[PDB]
Write a protein that binds this DNA or RNA. Sequence first.
RNA 1: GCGGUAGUAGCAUGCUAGGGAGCAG
RNA 2: UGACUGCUCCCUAGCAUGCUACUACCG
Lengths: 586, 78, 103, 187, 190
Amino acid sequence: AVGACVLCNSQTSLRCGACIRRPFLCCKCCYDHVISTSHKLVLSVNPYVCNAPGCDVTDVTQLYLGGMSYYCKSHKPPISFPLCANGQVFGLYKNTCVGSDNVTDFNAIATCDWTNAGDYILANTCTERLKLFAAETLKATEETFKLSYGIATVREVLSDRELHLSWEVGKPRPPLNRNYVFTGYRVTKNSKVQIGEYTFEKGAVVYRGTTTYKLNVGDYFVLTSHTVMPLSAPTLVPQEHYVRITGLYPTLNISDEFSSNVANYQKVGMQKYSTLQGPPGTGKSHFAIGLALYYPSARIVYTACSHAAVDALCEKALKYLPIDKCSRIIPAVECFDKFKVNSTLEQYVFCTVNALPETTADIVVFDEISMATNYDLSVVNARLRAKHYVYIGDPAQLPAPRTLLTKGTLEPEYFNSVCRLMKTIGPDMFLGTCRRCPAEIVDTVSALVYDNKLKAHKDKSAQCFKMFYKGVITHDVSSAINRPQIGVVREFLTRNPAWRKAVFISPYNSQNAVASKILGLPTQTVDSSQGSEYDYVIFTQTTETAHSCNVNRFNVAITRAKVGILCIMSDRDLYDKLQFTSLEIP
Amino acid sequence: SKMSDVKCTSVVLLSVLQQLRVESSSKLWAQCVQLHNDILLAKDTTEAFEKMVSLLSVLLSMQGAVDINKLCEEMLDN
Amino acid sequence: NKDFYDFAVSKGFFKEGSSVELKHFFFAQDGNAAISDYDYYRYNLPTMCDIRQLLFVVEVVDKYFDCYDGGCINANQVIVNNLDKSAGFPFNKWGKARLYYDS
Amino acid sequence: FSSLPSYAAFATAQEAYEQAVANGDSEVVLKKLKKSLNVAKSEFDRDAAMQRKLEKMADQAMTQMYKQARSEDKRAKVTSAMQTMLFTMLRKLDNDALNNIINNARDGCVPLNIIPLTTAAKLMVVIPDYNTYKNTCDGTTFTYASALWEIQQVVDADSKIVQLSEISMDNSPNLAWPLIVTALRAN
Amino acid sequence: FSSLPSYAAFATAQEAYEQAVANGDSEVVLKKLKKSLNVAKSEFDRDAAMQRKLEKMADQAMTQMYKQARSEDKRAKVTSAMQTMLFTMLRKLDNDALNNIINNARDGCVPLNIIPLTTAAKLMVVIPDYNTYKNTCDGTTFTYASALWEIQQVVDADSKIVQLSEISMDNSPNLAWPLIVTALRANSAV
RNA sequence: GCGGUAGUAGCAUGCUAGGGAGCAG
RNA sequence: UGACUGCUCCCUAGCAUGCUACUACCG
Ligand SMILES: [Zn+2]
Ligand SMILES: [Zn+2]
Ligand SMILES: [Zn+2]
């Protein structure tokens, strides 16, 4: 009941009747919320409505406070004083209220459909708590506009990986790839019954098996969502550098295999938070282990948004240093049970943004912070009250798709809370680790956005592929299948012997789904190639209008290779000075 | 004054035990109810204390339940 | 209620040897208590009476109950207080006594 | 109630009539002044009580809403409130056996069943480290809950019997430590 | 309260009278003003009171009729619920044994206490302790009420399955003892 | 000059209706 | 899951009666 309106710094019991999150607005604050826009309904400890039987008044501007109750205008016992009067709304804290100078914060960003770029613009032009309200409202609008599409179901079953699928009544269908997991429920007569986790991309309906299934009649698959609760801890911690190396457990040996570790070790010695801007091969592979060995007993927590990217470190986090000192817990969802699972007690707790309880910790070393709003930062800073932070990440690592984009692409810097801070105050560490990624990618990628931080560490043997091509497009309701550059990729792989050991990633899974029918290259998604980076690669774009060929949405997915790459680009923007070997079409 | 204190403490302890879904085990709940009803009818302050020890042992022998150490660091039990 | 107990103790109450002490509490019962209490109807036995004396005791009792008046009343003269109480079995699955006095 | 136009009108009429009467005058002027004064006086006097009733009623309504909010808040923290209260009273009791078992549970040595009161019946505890064993178990007797018990069995996490002579300072750290002592109450 | 039928006449008379007063005419016009305005306000008084009485009467009537309609709706739904309950419990009467024992009656009337005793398909037994258990339902089939029953399931006071192999004299003090035994009529009904 | 009547305000008295709580058999 | 009666205190709403007061009409 009693929450907090903070812009006016006013405890409140009121809330707007028709709004996004039942937001909390004080007397004068609810007033200029209900006169600057149209929100003529409020909720208190009890809702304001005439109490005579059969009466109906939604409005509050004409209700009266009667005999320990509320009465109204059309049906009027008016022995009272009006509820809305004298620049205020009747409630508790009617005296200890301040008001708002910026009248149109809610009136600007809580009044639109939460999809324009102006929402995020103002969210970055906010305070910590105001931008917390912003991030929670973005999660709320994500779920509330995801719960407006259909539920897939299999009513007569066919052979697995090739079924039939009817959907729903009149609703549209969302995008097509494995972004939306079709994990619904089955109904016997009134109850919900074990179903499993599914995903629909190819349709005759070809399914990808997150598990092996024996589908029965009627089985329904759809994401059923709850609402993210309000959070009680700030996302970012204010920048305060340490007086000394007091309170640390120093070691005697110094890392040697890593050539950019000692100065950054000292930095962690007197740095409180740490974020950098890097593609694969930026210390995310070895520097975490470097800190792990350089301070043994420090409570250091790691996390990636999916377990297959936590695995990229955890696979040898138990080999480089003893097993007894790491863990991450697996809920049951694709998660890897390598470590000591169902064990809160550990030292180097690996984690996933989706789930981890809170006991205690002291040092933060968290991986990518990309595909979520301030929820990711806040849940992990609430997870532990830490003395040191390392926010490994990038505003372009896996930039959060803004659901149904309608109005352009915003500046990459404007991420949750730290990426705009990031290159306005400078990178937190001196760190570049190009021991897998070669210089052929580094040249272009660092000349574009990551200036002078990553090194041209490894040379190339003039095998990088160029072929001038414009291309033609053909789109579907939720994806697109490519004639030209797919054919050119085919007839290119028919020229070189040792090129059929690559990946076939796709902007939407439809490309590899169609290709599996006649060649059969493995399925790959642009969603998250979690901790799985390989040298030889076949990249494809099909349709690239606003999600692909705009900014560094996947310029890290252009950092594919180690000694050789393929990166198909059907536009004429990201080639300005790229010098791939010029060879003619066959 | 040393007897009414133990009776009030026993009432509070039984309430705390009931909050932890103890009555889902008939034998344990019957024993706890018998002990609690016996403490309130006591006349001397030694039998009440041994029954209090027996009743508190039920709460102490439940691992997850509560945090003995946090509830001892809040300017509470030593 | 700890506040009241502390207030009473801070005023010289519940000392040793006092003539005022607590002996009224809320007692708890285990699972098999309702049936154990219902089993007390075993004390009800069939009893034959001395009829020639009961037929005179009833006359004296009726003499005692003689200064009143009674009879039958219509359904609109019945007074009921607290119509928000239980209606019994199986009528408690659908509402209180208000539902059946209104319907 | 001096913030209403009725008060202003009544005050001006009062002043004018008072000045005219104190100056001394005839009957018709007094009659006209009082006929123009009494209506304003009644106008003031009605609101003078209506405002008071409104203010007190508003105060009562705010009181009632505060009470409802506080009750709703209070009935949602009962578990934590009861636990804190129980441990506060347990502090205030100040008994040696209760203090002993509370400290033992706080360090890690908890029981496994209800502590018996008779001169018989079995008690099982868990001893997770050698220091607790050093403090409590010395010889073949066991001191717990301000009483005396006699050890008769030691079982490890692997459920193998360990003889009493085995446990020693350096001879212990090759064992499954969460031991389980089963003793009976000494006379 | 502002467009009453007499409001026009009252306001026009007041305006005309006060204009005449502001004209500074003789005392006769003032007396006429006073009389006319007094009678005008007097006639406006009842027109302002009776209407306010009537509105409150109408509002009370509306409220009473609304609550009557709500009561009727509740009655209809409770009637539907009772009908559904009766017709649902009808479907378990075992209409062959019941008919067989009804026809044997000399006029169609039978005591109610012997209907479950001779037509029920399932039997439930509650056992306090082991001594009572070994005298009533020992083994796998027992006889009660001149019929043969065979055990189907045994649970305890916590509603957890208990196997007959562990209901012994030694293992008795390890069970929540108010045991419930379920059996079926053998050779007859289920 | 006195009384009657019609509204309006404050105050007091007893019932009816609604809600919250206490004790007793 | 919450029976039947009896008594008492508190708060609000309506009705009836009485007291006083302010204007107006009538004789
Ligand atoms: Zn609003
Ligand atoms: Zn506000
Ligand atoms: Zn109304």
